[PDB]
Amino acid sequence: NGIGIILLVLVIATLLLVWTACFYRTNGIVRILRYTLGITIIGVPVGLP
Amino acid sequence: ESLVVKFVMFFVGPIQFVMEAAAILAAGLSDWVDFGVICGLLMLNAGVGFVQEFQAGSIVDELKKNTAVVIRDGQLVEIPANEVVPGDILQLEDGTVIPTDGRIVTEDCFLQIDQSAITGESLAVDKHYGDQTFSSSTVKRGEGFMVVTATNTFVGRAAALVNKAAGGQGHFTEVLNGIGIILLVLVIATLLLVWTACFYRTNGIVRILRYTLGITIIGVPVGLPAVVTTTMAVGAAYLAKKQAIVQKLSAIESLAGVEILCSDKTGTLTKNKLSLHEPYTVEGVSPDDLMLTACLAASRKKKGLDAIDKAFLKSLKQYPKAKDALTKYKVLEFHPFDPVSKKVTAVVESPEGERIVCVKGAPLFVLKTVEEDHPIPEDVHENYENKVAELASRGFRALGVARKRGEGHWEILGVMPCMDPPRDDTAQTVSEARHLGLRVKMLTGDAVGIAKETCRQLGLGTNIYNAERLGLGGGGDMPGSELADFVENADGFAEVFPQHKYRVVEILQNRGYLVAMTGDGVNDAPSLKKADTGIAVEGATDAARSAADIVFLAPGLSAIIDALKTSRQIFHRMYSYVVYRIALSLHLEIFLGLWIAILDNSLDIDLIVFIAIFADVATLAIAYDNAPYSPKPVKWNLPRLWGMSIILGIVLAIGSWITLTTMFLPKGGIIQNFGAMNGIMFLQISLTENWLIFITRAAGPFWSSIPSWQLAGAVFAVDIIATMFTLFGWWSENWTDIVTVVRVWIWSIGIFCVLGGFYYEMSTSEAFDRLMNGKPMKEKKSTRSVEDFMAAMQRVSTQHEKET
Amino acid sequence: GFYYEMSTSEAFDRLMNGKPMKEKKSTRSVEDFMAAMQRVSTQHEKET
Ligand SMILES: CCCCCCCC/C=C\CCCCCCCC(=O)O[C@@H](COC(=O)CCCCCCCCCCCCCCC)COP(=O)([O-])OCC[N+](C)(C)C
Ligand SMILES: CCCCCCCC/C=C\CCCCCCCC(=O)O[C@@H](COC(=O)CCCCCCCCCCCCCCC)COP(=O)([O-])OCC[N+](C)(C)C
Ligand SMILES: CCCCCCCC/C=C\CCCCCCCC(=O)O[C@@H](COC(=O)CCCCCCCCCCCCCCC)COP(=O)([O-])OCC[N+](C)(C)C
Ligand SMILES: CCCCCCCC/C=C\CCCCCCCC(=O)O[C@@H](COC(=O)CCCCCCCCCCCCCCC)COP(=O)([O-])OCC[N+](C)(C)C
């Protein structure tokens, strides 16, 4: 529960980076959501617990 | 009258006077845009205060939520509760509802009441002669007469405290004067920024004044002194539910932050009634049959009902608890108590024509009946005196039983111990008070050996001292720095006196602690005044109750701890809201202040009103939310409250500056199809701000405590209202499409997680607490010096046991 | 604002005079001394 929060913190921290940088380059929400799908797959390992 | 109380808040109050004087000036100049702004605020400001006092009044009237049986000219007659006059005697039966606070005359069979008038909790307390009963209680067992003390009763005194508190007073009112200046400082600091930057861009005074109207609406929250003061006033009515009547509202804040609770043993930690232990009896032939013999040796009628004896009559485990000691024994003669001899004996007749004799008396005087009846005459002297000695090592007062077959020969059946036992919840309570971050010290009049046993029973820690020998009386060879270390780390102080209780508080407070001293007597009052929260436990005299800061009606440490857990809930409700509503002021002074300075624009004056309206809607439900309390004590750490709020405002203003700066781009940035610069920024501000009440409300991280349906319903209702403004472009230039709105929603969820991250790793770190107060770690003992000292207490507190 | 948070702060008073906090007793040494007065002033009572 302590590790799983900090990886969730690190997913949100980069999702803030890839949403901000996809808002400035005005990207469709579909293109942004394919980016956050890719970062969530790598970002949260559900295999640890 | 509800329509009367509305227009009072409009007129009365100089802040309202300045606005409604400005509402006239704008209206007299036909400045209708700024007219609906200022009059929108008064409908807000007087509107929020009404729903706040309507919430407070509802809980008070429910706290104020009949018949009484009296005697008139000696005639039993039944009257409604409204006819009872204080200075009167009432009649009380089983199942009765107490109409007024009243002191019992005397009881043939003692009485129990439920102190759960609103809670409905199952447990009850015993009530004896001279004991104080309280209104809206219900009798579960017993009967007797009660002399009513008043109708202003304590609940009526508590309700009168709350209604007066609607004005506003206390130490937290001194804090609000400290907070309210710094927010006024922060308004002027940005008004200097948005006037300077509007002078250089030569702007008309009307355009500048629409900017300062917008920054004042966001900048000064007039809702804090209404919400903070009502939170205590509701909290004082929530505490009187928990049988704790605070003498001032600041007792809620002081009890919240108390770090050491010096709890007197005799009332709180122990039942204050004598009872017996069967596994701690002698190796007499029946441990189980031994108690039956002693119940024979006591008369069963009130003429011989000694309090020691009456304890024995009701220790029986058999279903005939009272009958089994009179079953077929056929008493022929009984010898009463004679103080020179210290013996009571009963002689009963057997069914098979035998005159058996049983006695009860002091173990020295039991042992002298026949000095050589028992075998091993010298060891049986030693073993009983040794096991009497270990009873004194356990502090148990000892009484013996002996028996005759009938001829005259004595048979020493044994000795049974009767002791004031710890209350059954107190072992769990001391465990729970240790989890609540505060330390319990037990101050007792008993000896050091006696109270070391009670420390063992509760799990307190068994490191106690003679109060006189250790110091605490102005004597001793111990240095004042070492006496303070002993008192700070003592687990209790035995043989303590009211002159010492003052010194324990005074020594601990020089160390910087907030000390809760429980006081019962009239002599405990100078310590209760000195103590940072002085507690008058149940059964306190008028001098303790008048000198206490918080007055209890439920005996026990668990009532003190549950009023401590509640007072941490009440505080964290007023603290989560202050951290929040300051951060929204900083969010929008930093954002709209730099929007004017850098870009000479702001959110529309129409939209800025709705953001301040939306922030106040969280006040309506912050009263109703389930309350998480922090474990460790809470203290209005104003350098930390201002560090957390300024960082949460800087983080929020960074997040809003990112959305705004995306929209400066051609192709729109956060705007996917079509959108407004204001409609999006109003939505983004309304979302990230109102979700901040989810962050600050939690004692730990925001995911720990799920919010109530009232708070999450009020925040989501705003987030629906704030969205529908954006989609349909109300008070904004254009419509904003549903796809841009869901971009702002997902971005504002991301910032809520960033804020929840910052506020958690900032609220819980002592590194941030250290930095904000600027207070270094000055007095940390060596790790080796603590080990040397820890054993020094264990040696000294062993010495204090052996002085006898 | 400036004159209030400057007139009342001892940090500004310290800086302007250039006088550091040279003689601050230990917090433990004050406790030792405070009780030393209370013992001695008890002794001075008992001399009669
Ligand atoms: C750690 C502390 C750091 C502080 C943050 C530093 C952030 C600042 C960093 C960078 C901001 C600079 C942005 C560059 C803009 C370039 C383009 C531009 O428009 O320039 C503009 C001028 O530009 C200015 O005047 C900037 C002045 C703002 C200084 C504020 C510092 C106060 C710090 C106190 C902190 C505040 C807290 C408030 C108190 C609670 C052009 O002038 P204009 O004609 O007016 O623009 C268009 C007008 N029109 C659209 C109507 C036509
Ligand atoms: C501590 C925080 C430090 C913050 C640093 C701030 C650095 C930022 C400074 C400057 C940012 C860039 C300014 C020039 C931008 C280009 C100029 C231009 O194109 O036209 C502009 C020329 O008008 C001017 O001359 C602008 C002058 C602004 C200087 C303000 C100093 C702020 C000092 C703060 C001291 C804080 C003291 C607090 C300390 C206690 C006019 O604009 P326009 O033609 O009407 O239309 C918009 C033009 N645009 C869209 C192309 C933009
Ligand atoms: C931490 C920092 C985060 C934010 C960094 C942001 C950097 C990115 C900066 C700019 C991104 C690119 C914008 C311009 C690019 C396109 C050119 C252009 O359109 O001109 C623009 C000029 O307006 C500006 O120059 C914007 C100036 C941004 C100032 C940000 C202040 C940061 C202070 C944060 C302190 C917070 C912490 C407070 C602590 C105390 C258009 O201006 P407009 O009139 O408005 O629009 C016209 C309409 N149109 C453009 C669609 C046609
Ligand atoms: C940790 C903090 C991180 C900070 C990150 C820094 C982020 C800075 C990153 C990028 C900033 C600049 C991005 C350039 C993109 C524009 C490209 C361009 O075409 O030129 C533009 C000019 O641009 C302007 O007119 C002014 C915009 C630049 C001012 C940005 C100041 C940022 C202040 C930061 C404050 C930080 C203070 C925070 C202190 C706490 C085009 O303008 P144009 O030629 O006139 O015509 C446009 C025609 N068109 C509309 C069809 C296109």
Numbering used by the authors:
A (entry chain A): 291 to 339
B (entry chain B): 110 to 174, 178 to 263, 266 to 918
C (entry chain C): 871 to 918
From the paper:
The S. cerevisiae plasma membrane H+-ATPase, Pma1, is a P3A-type ATPase and the primary protein component of the membrane compartment of Pma1 (MCP). Like all other P-type ATPases, the plasma membrane H+-ATPase has a transmembrane domain (TMD) composed of ten transmembrane α-helices (TMs), an actuator domain (A-domain), a nucleotide-binding domain (N-domain), and a phosphorylation domain (P-domain). Remarkably, we found that the Pma1 hexamer encircles a liquid-crystalline membrane domain composed of 57 ordered lipid molecules.
We determined the cryo-EM structure of autoinhibited Pma1 hexamer at pH 7.4 to 3.2 Å resolution without imposing any symmetry; we term this structure Pma1-pH7-C1. We found that the TMD and P-domains are well ordered and symmetric, while the A-and N-domains are asymmetric and flexible. At pH 7.4, the carboxyl-terminal regulatory α-helix binds to the phosphorylation domains of two neighboring Pma1 subunits, locking the hexamer in the autoinhibited state. The first C-tail helix is short, horizontal, and partially embedded in the membrane. The second C-tail helix is longer and mediates the interaction between the P-domain and the P-domain of the neighboring subunit. Major interactions include two inter-molecular salt bridges (R898:D599' and E901:R625') and an intramolecular hydrogen bond (S911:K566). We have shown that autoinhibition of Pma1 is achieved primarily by the C-tail helix-i simultaneously binding and constraining the movement of two neighboring P-domains.
